C-alpha cells in the first residue's frame, strides 16, 4: 500500500508562513495532492487551499506553504486536510494567536520628572523579520494603572515605530512600564520598564568585584572583595570607601553590621575582606552547612576627597557553595534506545550561572568515559546501554584535578526506554559531533540504524525535518543502502539556524506480522548566538587622540545593505545610576528561544512522543498519528 503521511508543526500561528510536508511512501507515478485548511469545528471558511504533485523524481515527498489569515478563553483549533488521489488525511492542530514579537527600547534607563521618554517599538514576526501591523501601546504607572493608551500602525515604518511620552513635573516616583501588544493578540503583551526618580549624574563609577564568583563555605580566608572606582572619562579615583556585607536567603536580607569597614581608595582601588568568623557570628546558626544555598551581597559607598560626589554600588547573588561547579542535564535527552550508545550533553556551570571552560567530567564506574567541557561549558559523554526495559540511571561527577572529592560537583539523572511498536526492537539513533557550531560551516549528522536482518534491506531512506524558531526550516531525504549501519548527512549550516534547531528524522516499513511500523528520533543542536546579518559602530576618523567638548567627529557604521539603523548616545553616569531593562541581542534570542514549541533535547517515550516533544504532528493514512496537543505552553507550569 502507498502509505500517505503528513507532518505539520504542533502549533500553527496566525499571519505566519507555515509549511506542511507530504509523503507518499511505497508509491509509483505522479500523485496529485491538494491541501485545504478549514476552521474548527464549523468549517465555515476555507482558510487555505494549495496544490502540488508528488513525482518519482522528487521521491514522492513534497511541501505546501500556506498562511492562515487572522479571521474575526478556550484554545482554538483548525482542521488540516490533505488529499492524495482517492485518499484523504485530516488532522486537528492547535492554533496560537501570537502574531510575532515586539521589542521596546527607551533612550535611557532612568528619568527625572519633567524629562521626555523617547522610545522605539520594533515589530517583527516569528522569523524576526519586520512587519507592518497595528500595535496597542500602554503607559503604566508603578501602581499598575494605565495612564495613556494608544493605537498605531507599523506599516511603511520598516518595522520600527518611533514614539515619545512626556513625564509631568508632578509625578509618582518608581518603576514605570511601557506595555505593547499586537491588535490581533492582546494576550501576548511585551513590556519594558524605566525608573522615574529625582537625581543628578555622578562623575565616576564604582565596581564591586569579589575575588571568586562564589564563596567556599570552608574557606578561612573569607570573602575577599576588590573595590574599583574610576571617573567616567577614564582617570582613576582617590577617596574613601565604606563597605558592608549581608546574607540573602531567597528574598530575606540580613545585614552584617559587624562587617562594616572603612578603607582608603588609593589609585582607584581598594580591598576589603569579610572574615569567616564575622560571617558566622552574624548569623545565629553554628552549622555553616545551612548557609549553603544562600548568597552574599556587598554594598560599597565611595566618597571623593573633595566630598562633592558620592557613588553607591552593589554586588549581590554570590552563592555560598561547597563546590566551584554545578552539573546540569538540561541538554541531555531523558529517553534512551536499549542496546544502543546513549549520548549525554553535560552542562557544567559556575555558581553564578556562567559556563565553565575545560572541566573534566565523568560517569561513575566508567572512568574511561571522561571528557572535557568546551567554551560553552558543554561536554559529550557516550555510554553503552544493554538491551533492557529498566530505567537507565546516570550519575556524573567532575574530575577537576587539584580539587578534593568533597568539592567535586555531582548530579544524578534518569532516562526511560524508548518504547517500540509491538516490541519489534527497531531503533534509530541520531548522533552529532559536539562542538560550538557557527553559520557557514557543515555538520555531519550520524544516522545509526538498529533492527533485525529480516527487514533491514527494506530501509532505503530516512525522512529528516528541521525545526527552527518554531517552524520548519528544511526537510529532506537520506539515502541508505542495505547493510550500512551508519550513514552521514553533510548538513550545510547558514544563518537560518540561529539560535538553535531540532533535527527529527524517521523511517517507516512493513514488518513482523505485516504491520506498518514507524521509528523516529530527534536531536537538539545549539548554534552560536549572533545577529542574522551584522552591525558595527566604530570611529570614522584617525585615532587615537581623545575628542574635545564640542569637537566634530565621524562615526563609521557598517551593516547590511538597505537596512534602517536607529541610534542613541547615552552618558554612562545614567548606567552608574541604573543599568536595567537595556535592549540587547541576547535578550532577543532569549525571548525567541523561550517561545519555542519544542520541549525536549531529543527523542520521546514512543515514535509519536518524538514528534510531539519536538513540536510536530505526524499523521499517516494507515492510522499512525501523534496524540492531540491542547497545551499552548510547554510542561510544566
Amino acid at each position: 500500500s502507498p502509505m500517505y503521511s503528513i507532518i505539520t508543526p504542533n502549533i500553527l500561528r496566525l499571519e505566519s508562513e507555515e509549511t506542511m510536508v507530504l509523503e507518499a511512501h511505497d508509491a509509483q507515478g505522479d500523485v496529485p495532492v491538494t491541501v485545504t485548511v478549514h476552521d474548527f469545528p464549523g468549517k465555515k471558511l476555507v482558510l487555505s487551499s494549495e496544490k502540488t504533485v508528488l513525482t518519482p523524481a522528487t521521491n514522492h515527498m513534497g511541501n505546501v506553504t500556506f498562511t492562515i489569515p487572522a479571521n474575526r478563553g478556550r484554545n482554538k483549533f483548525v482542521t488540516v486536510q490533505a488529499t492524495f488521489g482517492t485518499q484523504v488525511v485530516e488532522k486537528v492542530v492547535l492554533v496560537s494567536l501570537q502574531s510575532g514579537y515586539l521589542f521596546i527600547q527607551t533612550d535611557k534607563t532612568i528619568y527625572t520628572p519633567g524629562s521626555t521618554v523617547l522610545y522605539r517599538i520594533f515589530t517583527v514576526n516569528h522569523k524576526l523579520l519586520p512587519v507592518g501591523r497595528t500595535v496597542m501601546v500602554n503607559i503604566e504607572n508603578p501602581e499598575g494603572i494605565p495612564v495613556k493608551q494608544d493605537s498605531l500602525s507599523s506599516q511603511n515604518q520598516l518595522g520600527v515605530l518611533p514614539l515619545s511620552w512626556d513625564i509631568p513635573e508632578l509625578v509618582n516616583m518608581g518603576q514605570w512600564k511601557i506595555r505593547a501588544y499586537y491588535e490581533n493578540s492582546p494576550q501576548q503583551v511585551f513590556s519594558t520598564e524605566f525608573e522615574v526618580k529625582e537625581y543628578v549624574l555622578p562623575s565616576f563609577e564604582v565596581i564591586v568585584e569579589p575575588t571568586e564568583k562564589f564563596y567556599y563555605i570552608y574557606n578561612e580566608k573569607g570573602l575577599e572583595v576588590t573595590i574599583t572606582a574610576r571617573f567616567l572619562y577614564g582617570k582613576k579615583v582617590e577617596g574613601t570607601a565604606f563597605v558592608i556585607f549581608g546574607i540573602q536567603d531567597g528574598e530575606q536580607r540580613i545585614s552584617l553590621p559587624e562587617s562594616l569597614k572603612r578603607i582608603p581608595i588609593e589609585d582607584g582601588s581598594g580591598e576589603v575582606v569579610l572574615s569567616r568568623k564575622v560571617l558566622l557570628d552574624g548569623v545565629q546558626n553554628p552549622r555553616a552547612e545551612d548557609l549553603v544555598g544562600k548568597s552574599l551581597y556587598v554594598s560599597a559607598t565611595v566618597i571623593l576627597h573633595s566630598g562633592s560626589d558620592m557613588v553607591q554600588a552593589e554586588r549581590s547573588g554570590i552563592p555560598i557553595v561547597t563546590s566551584p561547579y554545578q552539573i546540569h542535564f538540561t541538554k541531555t535527552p531523558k529517553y534512551f534506545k536499549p542496546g544502543m550508545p546513549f549520548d549525554l550533553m553535560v552542562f557544567v556551570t559556575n555558581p553564578d550561572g556562567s559556563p565553565a571552560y575545560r572541566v573534566p567530567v565523568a560517569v561513575q564506574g566508567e572512568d574511561t568515559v571522561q571528557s572535557l567541557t568546551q567554551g560553552d561549558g558543554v561536554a559529550k559523554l557516550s555510554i553503552n546501554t544493554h538491551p533492557s526495559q529498566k530505567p537507565l540511571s546516570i550519575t556524573v561527577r567532575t574530575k577537576k584535578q587539584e580539587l578534593s572529592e568533597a568539592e567535586q560537583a555531582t548530579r544524578t539523572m534518569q532516562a526511560l526506554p524508548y518504547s517500540t511498536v509491538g516490541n519489534s526492537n527497531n531503533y534509530l539513533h541520531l548522533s552529532v559531533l559536539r562542538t560550538e557550531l557557527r553559520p557557514g560551516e557543515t555538520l555531519n549528522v550520524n544516522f545509526l540504524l538498529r533492527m533485525d536482518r529480516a527487514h533491514e534491506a527494506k530501509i532505503r531512506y530516512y525522512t529528516y525535518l528541521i525545526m527552527n524558531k518554531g517552524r520548519l526550516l528544511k526537510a529532506g531525504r537520506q539515502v541508505r543502502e542495505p547493510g550500512q549501519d551508519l550513514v552521514v548527512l553533510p548538513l550545510s549550516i547558514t544563518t537560518d539556524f540561529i539560535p538553535s534547531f531540532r533535527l527529527v528524522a524517521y523511517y517507516t516499513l512493513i514488518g513482523a506480522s505485516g504491520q506498518r511500523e514507524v521509528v523516529a528520533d530527534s536531536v537538539w543542536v545549539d548554534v552560536k548566538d549572533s545577529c542574522v546579518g551584522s552591525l558595527v559602530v566604530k570611529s570614522g576618523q584617525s585615532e587615537d587622540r581623545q575628542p574635545v567638548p564640542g569637537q566634530q567627529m565621524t562615526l563609521k557604521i557598517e551593516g547590511d545593505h538597505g537596512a534602517r539603523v536607529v541610534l542613541v548616545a547615552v552618558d554612562k553616569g545614567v548606567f552608574v545610576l541604573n543599568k536595567k531593562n537595556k535592549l540587547t541581542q541576547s535578550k532577543i534570542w532569549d525571548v525567541v528561544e523561550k517561545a519555542d514549541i519544542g520541549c525536549t533535547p531529543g527523542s520521546g517515550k514512543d515514535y509519536a512522543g518524538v514528534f510531539s516533544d519536538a513540536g510536530l504532528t505526524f499523521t499517516s493514512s494507515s492510522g499512525q498519528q501523534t496524540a492531540q496537543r491542547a497545551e499552548l505552553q510547554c510542561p510544566q507550569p
Partner: protein, 900 residues
C-alpha cells in the same frame, strides 16, 4: 589682569544632555560582501565623560540586530566640574562646589576662578565687583572651590562659573541650571471621592456631583497649585453558570437503528450532544478526533430516516402507516437543528413544512395518526390541552425551520401568524405549567408574549425557578427547558440564573426510556444559555465635567475596552465644579489637589543636630563643631564636611592630634597637602552619639587676607544617606553664618553690595553734587540729623530726623518726622554715623522697605551719605569749601531745583 584670558572672552560649556543622537540613518551605500559602510558626522556635546552609542538595524531580509555598544570618551587637560544639586529651596543659603581638575602630568597651574553674578541669586558676586580667587592646582591633581549662594526666585535658575590660567591660553566655563523650589513641603489633599452610577444613583438617568474647592488654608504665599480630576471605569465581570461537564455526555453518542420513530430516538441524543459540545467548546476534554465519528452517526441516522419519507414528504413509523403530525414536526425540528453539522436536503425539510402547514388545519394542528412510541413526546402525552401543546410544538418546529424554508414555502409566515393568533387568544386559562411554558416560548419567538399573558407566564413558575406540574419529572425538565429558552428570548437575565441553577441541580444528563424530548430540550436550552453570553455587564459612561474657568464642556466616554484607563484633567485654579454622568455602568471620580503647605516642623536638620562656632583664639581662630544624631540609637559611620573661610586653613598639629584614635579618621591625603590650597577637609567619624553632643575643635590660621570673607561651612551626615544631612555656616565677623539680606513674606533682596557711595577716588565739587542729585533716579534728597543708633545682631538701624526736605519723591515725609535708615552691620564702621550729627543723604526709590505706614530706608550702593558740618565747624577755614558747597547745594536745589 595681565597674561590671562578675560571673563567675557570665555564661552562656557552648557550642553549636558543625558542622552542625544536620537537619529535615523539608512544604509544605501554600495555593498561590499553584503556590508554597506556609512560615515556619519556628529557634533559632540559639552559633557566630559564617556558616551555609550547604541545601534539597532532592521532589514527586510536580515531582520533585527542590536549592535555592541560603542564607547567614546571626551576630555580636557583642565576643566571645571560644577557639582549642582537637583533642587534647592528658595531663600535658603546653600554651599555649592566647583571642582577644578588639572590632568597635566608635571605642570602646576596658577588659576583664577570666578563666580558670575546673577540677580536671581544672592552672593558676594555683585554687578560692581567680581567674586574671583587665585588658586594653585598641582600636577595630576584637583582643587575644590566653595561658593555660598542664596536662591531668590523659584523656577529653573542658572549658575555659571568660569576659570582661566595665568601665562597660558587655557580656560574653561560651566553654565548649568537648577530647580528653585518654594519654602513649603509637597502636599496633596483628597478633595473628593465619588461613586458614579447614573442608572442607580442618578435621577432621570443623569447624576450631578458638585465638587468643593480645596481648603488651602496653610498654602505657602505666592505658590501655584494643580487640581487633578481622575475618572476611571469600574469593570464588573458578569457571572455564568458552569456548563455541564463533557464527560457526562459520553453516553449520548448512540448508534441509530430501528424504524421511523426509533431512528429519531437514537438520532436525538447524538445530535443534541454534538450541538451542545460545539457551542460550549468542550471537544478538548472529550476528544477532538471523536467528533468525526459522532458526525458519521448523525449522517447515518439522517440517511436511515430518508427511507421512511412518504411521497407526501411526510413521516410515519412505517411506509404504509398514516403520516404523523408530531413525528413530522419533530423530524423538522431535529433536521433544522442539524444543518450546521451534516448535509440536509432542503426539499425534505421544506416539503415536510409545506405538508405540516396545509394539514395543520382555524389554523391549528391536529394529529390524525398518533405516534406509536408515546414516551418520546414527553409533556404532550397528557389528554388535557392537546391542541395548544401540539400547536406550540409544531409552531416552534416551523420557526426553527423558518430561515431555511421561507423562500420555497410561501405559506409559512401567514401560518405562523394564524397559529400565533390562536395561541394568543387562548393562552389564559390553560393552567398546566408545561403548556404555559411551551406556548410561552412559542409566543416569545414572535415577541407576542406581553402584558397579563407574560404576567401569568412569570407567576406560573413555582419557586421562581421551575415550571412544575404533578406527574413525571421529565415533563417538568422539558417544560423548564422551554421556559429557559423563553427567558433567553425575552432577554430577562434577572430571572435566568435561578432557572439555570435548578436545571443544573437536577443532574439530568439525558438518555433512557423516553428521554427524547427531555434530552433534546434541556441541552438545547443550556447550549442557548451558553450562546447568549452575558459575560460582561454593558459599560458605556458619558461623563461631562464643568469648570467655571473653562469656556466649553469637557466630555469623556468610558467604554469597556478602556475601563481601567486613568482619565486625568488638570486645573491650575482652585475651583468648585460640576460633574454630570449618564449611561449604563459604574465608575469612580477622584478629585485630588496638589499644592505647597507651610511646615511648622523644620525641613532641615531632621536627623542631625549641628552647632558650629568660630571664636578669636587667645589672626588665628578656633572652630568648634558639636554634632548629635537624632535617633533612638547611636549613628553609625558619619562624615563631617568642612569648608574653610576664604583665606583660612586648618592647623596641621591639631589635625594630627584628631586623627589618632578617638574613633576619628583623617586620611593621609588630607594631612599631606600643604597649608596652601587646603580650603576643604573631611573628618570621618566612626559613630556619633544620640545621647549628647560629640564635640571637636581645631585652630584655623589666616594665610591670605581679603576684604570680603565668605562664610565657611560644616555638613554632617551618615554614609548610608546623604539626603538626611545638616549644614551650618560660620563667619568670624558677627553673623550666624548667613550672608546679608532683607526678607519679608517669602520675598528676599540681596544686601551684599557697597555700603554707600564713596567719594574716595578724587574730590567732590558743587557741580558734581548738583549733577548727581538731579538725576531722575534720585528719588529723595534730605538734610537729616542722627537721632538714634539701634545696634542689632543683623542690621543696624539709623533713626534720623528729617531736618529739611531738600527734594521729596515717593515718600511724603514732613520736616520734623523721623525715618529709619537700615544698613548691614559690616558697614557700621565704614559709615561712622554719630548721634547729634547732621548729614546730606539722597537715595533711590528701590531702597524703600517696605510700606508707607512704617516706611524705612535702605542704605545701598547708590545711597549718598555725606557728613554735614556744624556751623561752628563752618567757622573754620578748612571746612570752608564743604560748607560753601553744601549751603549752595541746599539753596540751588530748594529754590531752582532740577532744570531737566
Amino acid at each position: 589682569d595681565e597674561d590671562i584670558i578675560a571673563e567675557e572672552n570665555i564661552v562656557s560649556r552648557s550642553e549636558f544632555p543625558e542622552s542625544w543622537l536620537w537619529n535615523v540613518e539608512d544604509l544605501k551605500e554600495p555593498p561590499k560582501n553584503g556590508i554597506s559602510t556609512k560615515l556619519m558626522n556628529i557634533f559632540l556635546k559639552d559633557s566630559i565623560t564617556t558616551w555609550e552609542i547604541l545601534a539597532v538595524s532592521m532589514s527586510d531580509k536580515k531582520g533585527i540586530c542590536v549592535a555592541d555598544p560603542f564607547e567614546v570618551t571626551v576630555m580636557q587637560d583642565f576643566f571645571i566640574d560644577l557639582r549642582l544639586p537637583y533642587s534647592v529651596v528658595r531663600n535658603e543659603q546653600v554651599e555649592i562646589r566647583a571642582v577644578l581638575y588639572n590632568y597635566r602630568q608635571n605642570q602646576e597651574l596658577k588659576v583664577r576662578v570666578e563666580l558670575l553674578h546673577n540677580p536671581a541669586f544672592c552672593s558676594l558676586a555683585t554687578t560692581k565687583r567680581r567674586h574671583q580667587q587665585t588658586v594653585t592646582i598641582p600636577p595630576k591633581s584637583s582643587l575644590s572651590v566653595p561658593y555660598v549662594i542664596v536662591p531668590l526666585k523659584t523656577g529653573l535658575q542658572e549658575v555659571e562659573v568660569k576659570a582661566a590660567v595665568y601665562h597660558h591660553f587655557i580656560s574653561d566655563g560651566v553654565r548649568k541650571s537648577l530647580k528653585v523650589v518654594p519654602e513649603g513641603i509637597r502636599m496633596n489633599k483628597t478633595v473628593a471621592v465619588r461613586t458614579l452610577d447614573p442608572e442607580r444613583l442618578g435621577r432621570e438617568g443623569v447624576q450631578k456631583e458638585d465638587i468643593p474647592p480645596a481648603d488651602l488654608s496653610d498654602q505657602v504665599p505666592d505658590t501655584e497649585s494643580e487640581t487633578r480630576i481622575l475618572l476611571q471605569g469600574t469593570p464588573v465581570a458578569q457571572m455564568t453558570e458552569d456548563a455541564v461537564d463533557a464527560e457526562r455526555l459520553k453516553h449520548l453518542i448512540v448508534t441509530p437503528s430501528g424504524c421511523g420513530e426509533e431512528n429519531m430516538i437514537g438520532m436525538t441524543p447524538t445530535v443534541i450532544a454534538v450541538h451542545y459540545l460545539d457551542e460550549t467548546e468542550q471537544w478538548e476534554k472529550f476528544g477532538l478526533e471523536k467528533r468525526q465519528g459522532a458526525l458519521e452517526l448523525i449522517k447515518k441516522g439522517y440517511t436511515q430516516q430518508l427511507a421512511f419519507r412518504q411521497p407526501s414528504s411526510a413521516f410515519a413509523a412505517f411506509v404504509k402507516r398514516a403520516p404523523s403530525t408530531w413525528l413530522t414536526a419533530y423530524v423538522v425540528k431535529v433536521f433544522s437543528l442539524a444543518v450546521n453539522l451534516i448535509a440536509i436536503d432542503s426539499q425534505v425539510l421544506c416539503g415536510a413544512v409545506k405538508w405540516l402547514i396545509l394539514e395543520k388545519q382555524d389554523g391549528v394542528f391536529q394529529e390524525d395518526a398518533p405516534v406509536i412510541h408515546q414516551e418520546m413526546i414527553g409533556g404532550l402525552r397528557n389528554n388535557n390541552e392537546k391542541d395548544m401543546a401540539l400547536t406550540a410544538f409544531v409552531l416552534i418546529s416551523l420557526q426553527e425551520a423558518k430561515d431555511i424554508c421561507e423562500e420555497q414555502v410561501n405559506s409559512l409566515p401567514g401560518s405562523i401568524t394564524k397559529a400565533g393568533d390562536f395561541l394568543e387568544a387562548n393562552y389564559m386559562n390553560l393552567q398546566r405549567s408545561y403548556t404555559v411554558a411551551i406556548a410561552g416560548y412559542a409566543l416569545a419567538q414572535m415577541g407576542r408574549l406581553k402584558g397579563p399573558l407574560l404576567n401569568k407566564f412569570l407567576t406560573t413558575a413555582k419557586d421562581k425557578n421551575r415550571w412544575e406540574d404533578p406527574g413525571k419529572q421529565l415533563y417538568n425538565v422539558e417544560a423548564t427547558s422551554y421556559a429557559l429558552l423563553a427567558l433567553l428570548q425575552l432577554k430577562d437575565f434577572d430571572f435566568v440564573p435561578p432557572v439555570v441553577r435548578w436545571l443544573n441541580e437536577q443532574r439530568y444528563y439525558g438518555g433512557g426510556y423516553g428521554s427524547t424530548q427531555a434530552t433534546f430540550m434541556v441541552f438545547q436550552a443550556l447550549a442557548q444559555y451558553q450562546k447568549d453570553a452575558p459575560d460582561h455587564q454593558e459599560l458605556n459612561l458619558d461623563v461631562s465635567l464643568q469648570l467655571p474657568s473653562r469656556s466649553s464642556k469637557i466630555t469623556h466616554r468610558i467604554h469597556w475596552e478602556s475601563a481601567s484607563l486613568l482619565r486625568s484633567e488638570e486645573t491650575k485654579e482652585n475651583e468648585g465644579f460640576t460633574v454630570t454622568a449618564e449611561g449604563k455602568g459604574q465608575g469612580t471620580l477622584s478629585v485630588v489637589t496638589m499644592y505647597h503647605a507651610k511646615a511648622k516642623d523644620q525641613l532641615t536638620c531632621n536627623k542631625f543636630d549641628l552647632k558650629v562656632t568660630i571664636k578669636p583664639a587667645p589672626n588665628t581662630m578656633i572652630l568648634e563643631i558639636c554634632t548629635r544624631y537624632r535617633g533612638d540609637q547611636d549613628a553609625t559611620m558619619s562624615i563631617l564636611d568642612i569648608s574653610m573661610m576664604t583665606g583660612f586653613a586648618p592647623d596641621t598639629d591639631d589635625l594630627k592630634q584628631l586623627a589618632n584614635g578617638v574613633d576619628r579618621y583623617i586620611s593621609k591625603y588630607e594631612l599631606d597637602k600643604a597649608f596652601s590650597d587646603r580650603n576643604t577637609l573631611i573628618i570621618y567619624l566612626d559613630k556619633v552619639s544620640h545621647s549628647e553632643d560629640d564635640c571637636l575643635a581645631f585652630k584655623v590660621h589666616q594665610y591670605f587676607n581679603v576684604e570680603l570673607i565668605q562664610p565657611g561651612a560644616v555638613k554632617v551626615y551618615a554614609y548610608y544617606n546623604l539626603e538626611e544631612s545638616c549644614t551650618r555656616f560660620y563667619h568670624p565677623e558677627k553673623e550666624d553664618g548667613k550672608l546679608n539680606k532683607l526678607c519679608r513674606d517669602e520675598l528676599c533682596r540681596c544686601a551684599e553690595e557697597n555700603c554707600f557711595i564713596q567719594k574716595s577716588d578724587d574730590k567732590v565739587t558743587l557741580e558734581e553734587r548738583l549733577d548727581k542729585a538731579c538725576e531722575p533716579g534720585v528719588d529723595y534728597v534730605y538734610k537729616t540729623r542722627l537721632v538714634k543708633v539701634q545696634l542689632s545682631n543683623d542690621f543696624d538701624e539709623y533713626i534720623m530726623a528729617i531736618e529739611q526736605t531738600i527734594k521729596s519723591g515717593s515718600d511724603e515725609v514732613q520736616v520734623g518726622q523721623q525715618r529709619t535708615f537700615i544698613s548691614p552691620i559690616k558697614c557700621r564702621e565704614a559709615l561712622k554715623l554719630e548721634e547729634k550729627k547732621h548729614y546730606l543723604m539722597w537715595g533711590l526709590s528701590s531702597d524703600f522697605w517696605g510700606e508707607k505706614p512704617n516706611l524705612s530706608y535702605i542704605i545701598g550702593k547708590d545711597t549718598w551719605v555725606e557728613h554735614w558740618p556744624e556751623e561752628d565747624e563752618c567757622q573754620d577755614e578748612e571746612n570752608q569749601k564743604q560748607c560753601q558747597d553744601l549751603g549752595a547745594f541746599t539753596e540751588s536745589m530748594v529754590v531752582f531745583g532740577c532744570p531737566n
